[PDB]
């Protein structure tokens, strides 16, 4: 088709329609790694998230306002 000089030009993103011969093997290695990070993010997100509208009762807010007066 054309000449892309791929012998030395090897960018991280491929360089003119690049697909390695062992692309199937690496794709599985990436999908498992990608799946292992979404689950880790989910566990971190659930354990770290909180509801900012429920951390204090309205009775507690009344005492804060009265003391601040």
């Amino acid at each position: 088709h054309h000449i892309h000089t791929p012998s030395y030009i090897k960018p991280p993103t491929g360089g003119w329609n690049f697909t390695p011969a062992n692309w199937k093997q690496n794709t599985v290695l990436v999908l498992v790694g990608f799946t292992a990070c979404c689950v880790g993010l989910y566990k971190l997100g659930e354990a770290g998230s909180y509801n900012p509208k429920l951390k204090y009762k309205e009775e507690e807010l009344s005492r804060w306002n009265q003391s601040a007066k």
């Binding site: 054309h2 000449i3 892309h4 000089t5 030395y8 030009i9 003119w16």
Partner: protein, 105 residues
């Protein structure tokens, strides 16, 4: 340079004006049937002055023609996408083919 009627140089110069006349007409008129009327009208305005012998008279018409083209010029002319000024011009130009020259950096 003086104008030489019925010469080879004049034919290219006149044909250059004729292309600009019809290409301008194509920009303004977006329908083929309406474009043919204007295209034939321009030629009827071109053949009428074909039998002119005096270079001095011919200079005025060339001056006149180059002013109508500038006056009627479309602000958004039609350009082929891969031609200069087109949408796909200089898109994904293939890299220059040349062997690398190593250097001991």
């Amino acid at each position: 340079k003086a104008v030489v009627p019925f010469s080879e140089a004049n034919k290219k110069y006149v044909s250059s004006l004729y292309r600009k006349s019809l290409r301008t007409a194509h920009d303004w008129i977006n329908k083929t049937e309406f474009y043919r009327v204007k295209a034939s009208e321009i030629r009827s305005r071109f053949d009428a002055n074909k039998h002119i012998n005096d270079p001095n008279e011919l200079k005025v018409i060339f001056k006149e023609t180059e002013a109508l083209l500038e006056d009627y010029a479309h602000p958004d002319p039609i350009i082929p996408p891969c031609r200069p000024g087109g949408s796909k011009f200089e898109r994904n130009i293939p890299p220059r083919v040349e062997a690398r020259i190593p250097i001991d950096v």
